[PDB]
Amino acid sequence: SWTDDLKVCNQTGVGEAINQIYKDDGRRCEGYESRDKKCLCISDNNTSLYAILSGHNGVTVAENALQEMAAELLLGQLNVCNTDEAVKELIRQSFMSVEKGYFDSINPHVATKTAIQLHLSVLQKLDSLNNALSVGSSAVLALIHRSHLYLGNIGNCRALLCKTDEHDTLTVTQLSVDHNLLNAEEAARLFRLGLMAQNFEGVPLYSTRCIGNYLGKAGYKDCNFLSSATAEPVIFEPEIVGGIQITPACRFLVLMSSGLCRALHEIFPGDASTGNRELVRMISEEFQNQSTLGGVAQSVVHRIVQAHHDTYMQLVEEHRSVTFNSRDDVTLLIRNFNY
Fold first, then answer.
1. Most Cβ neighbours (<10 Å): which of 23, 45, 168, 246?
2. How far is the C-alpha of 245 from the C-alpha of 259, rounded, in Å?
3. Three-class SS of residue 140?
């Protein structure tokens, strides 16, 4: 619609750090293209959207997905549905047809791959290029519709609500569901497909659900390394939580992109929720120290990314294990109810 234009939320602060490849040398290689796509859109007095879409191996899908979901639920298909169930169904449908749109788009691309692969059983290399149908996107979108918070996510991106309770202080509570190996249920799903952890060595933080990525869906076989599986590994089944009544007790909402989750887990060690607490310490220390909302967000991001490169550099300093060696686009969104 392009979201880029839609009115901006003065109650939301943004932090961004651009993807990096860390050189052993010491130097780095920042990208140009961000693969993270954001929205902090006010459609109307009641309706507003906060979303991060993390593009994988490409920006095409994340771009297209944000534009389409804004279009499917912003102008303004929301006043026709009362019940929380109907609003949930609205967002559920919005994902469904973002995926429908993907598979209509790549339709010929696969028919081109199979066409050239059929003539095998002078350039040839463009066959690798042709496996550009590995492009897809994680997504997290919080939709505040008139004192009610709705949350639809798929893949790596994450959503946190910070509540203060009966003797305080700050209770972090993840509304998102991680669709990757940080989530045992997902590990067990893969286990059951005939996959093992060793199949995912060297592959950063593979989301086990996402928009698009034909290569991990139908024709996962043309993975090497998705190829042992006995059924499609990457399923399309987003998670939708409905009608969280934003109360005076609800303090602020935190949206995390894929890059950000990856980074946190690489520096914080284990258990995919210690990372959260340390992100929300980190910010709660920042709103005693800063005043501008986008400044708080940019300071916290800026800490982590160098906390990340220190962890890398303090790994190359000691016995050079070196698990990670890069950074994806880090993005942080803080929607604030109570300063």
1. 246
2. 29
3. strand
Beta-strand ranges (E) seen in the chain are 12-17, 20-22, 28-30, 36-42, 47-56, 136-145, 148-154, 158-163, 171-174, 211-212, 239-245, 250-256, 326-327, 330-336
This structure was determined by X-ray
Amino acid (one-letter) located at 249: A
Domain count, the chain: 1
For 85, counting Cβ atoms within 10 Å of its Cβ (0-12 exposed, 13-18 middle, 19+ buried), the class is exposed
Of 87, 142, 86, 135, the closest CA to residue 256 belongs to 142
Q: What is the resolution of this structure in A?
A: 3.0
Handedness of CA 29, 60, 255, 240 (dihedral sign): negative
B/e letters for 114-152, b = 16+ CB within 10 Å, e = fewer, are eeeeeeeeeeeeeeeebbebebbbbbbbbbbbeeebbbb
Q: Mind giving me the DSSP string for 161-206? A: EEE--BTBS-EEEE-S---BTTSHHHHHHHHTTT--GGGGTT-TT-
Q: Which two tokens stand for residue 25?
A: 């040398």
- Parent domain of 84: 1-339
CATH code for position 44: 3.60.40.10
Distance CA 273, CA 269 (A): 10
The Cα 96–Cα 241 span in angstroms is: 16
3-class secondary-structure state, position 215: helix
Contacts of 133 (CB under 8 A, 6+ apart): 106, 109, 110, 113, 213, 214, 215
In the numeric block, the tokens 């909402």 are attached to 253
CB 244 within 8 A of CB 149: yes
